[PDB]
């Protein structure tokens, strides 16, 4: 589909039977979801942005469905004020910016 | 143009005869630029992101050329780690997300 930007581009994503709302963010290299338990090993990581850095947990090969699209990749979990879908996954669903 | 997301969507913008590199960011409501001087009166403002809140300076009605397309709107200036073009200006140049 074609998503306009009059409002925040929030969409529905499916993770392990969990359905959540996420922000399509071209300004994020990675995907950062709010606190949630995921199976598997994870490496500690520090990610930054406006304001500074926060510590998150990195999980790999996590299956995620975005608007009926299947995607699998790295997912960072930490105290994020909002769920963020980054470029690592956006490229997988063929998402582009157009004007 | 159509922009893919395998790399950061950085583009060149022209603001006040100055050329700068900025990130097309659908995950930002506003446009925030690194410290620089702009004409006109500005009001102090606080904005937030991943690592918390920061203080910025708000300039209104500033003309900004993004890859040749003209926009005129609010530009916030402050300690952002990277220049970002937010939705306030992206909507003005007709930018959409597609997949």
């Amino acid at each position: 589909p074609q998503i306009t930007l009059w409002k925040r581009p929030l969409v529905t994503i499916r993770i392990g039977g969990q359905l959540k709302e996420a922000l399509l963010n071209t300004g994020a290299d990675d995907t950062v979801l709010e606190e949630m338990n995921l199976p598997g090993k994870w490496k500690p990581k520090m990610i930054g942005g406006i304001g500074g850095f926060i510590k998150v947990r990195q999980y790999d090969q996590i299956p995620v469905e975005i608007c009926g699209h299947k995607a699998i990749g790295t997912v960072l979990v930490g105290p994020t004020p909002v769920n963020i879908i980054g470029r690592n996954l956006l490229t997988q669903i063929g998402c582009t910016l157009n004007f | 143009p159509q922009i893919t997301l395998w790399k950061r969507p950085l583009v060149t913008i022209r603001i006040g005869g100055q050329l700068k590199e900025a990130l097309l960011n659908t995950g930002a409501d506003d446009t925030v630029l690194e410290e620089m001087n702009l004409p006109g009166k500005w009001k102090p403002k606080m904005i937030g992101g991943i690592g918390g809140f920061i203080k910025v300076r708000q300039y209104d009605q500033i003309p900004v050329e993004i890859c040749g397309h003209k926009a005129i709107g609010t530009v916030l200036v402050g300690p952002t780690p990277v220049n970002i073009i937010g939705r306030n200006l992206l909507t003005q140049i007709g930018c959409t997300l597609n997949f």
């Binding site: 963010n25 994020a28 942005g49 909002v82 | 960011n25 991943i50 990277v82 970002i84």
Partner: peptide, 8 residues
């Protein structure tokens, strides 16, 4: 890796 999410 930088996440540039920004809220007004």
């Amino acid at each position: 890796a930088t996440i540039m999410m920004q809220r007004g």
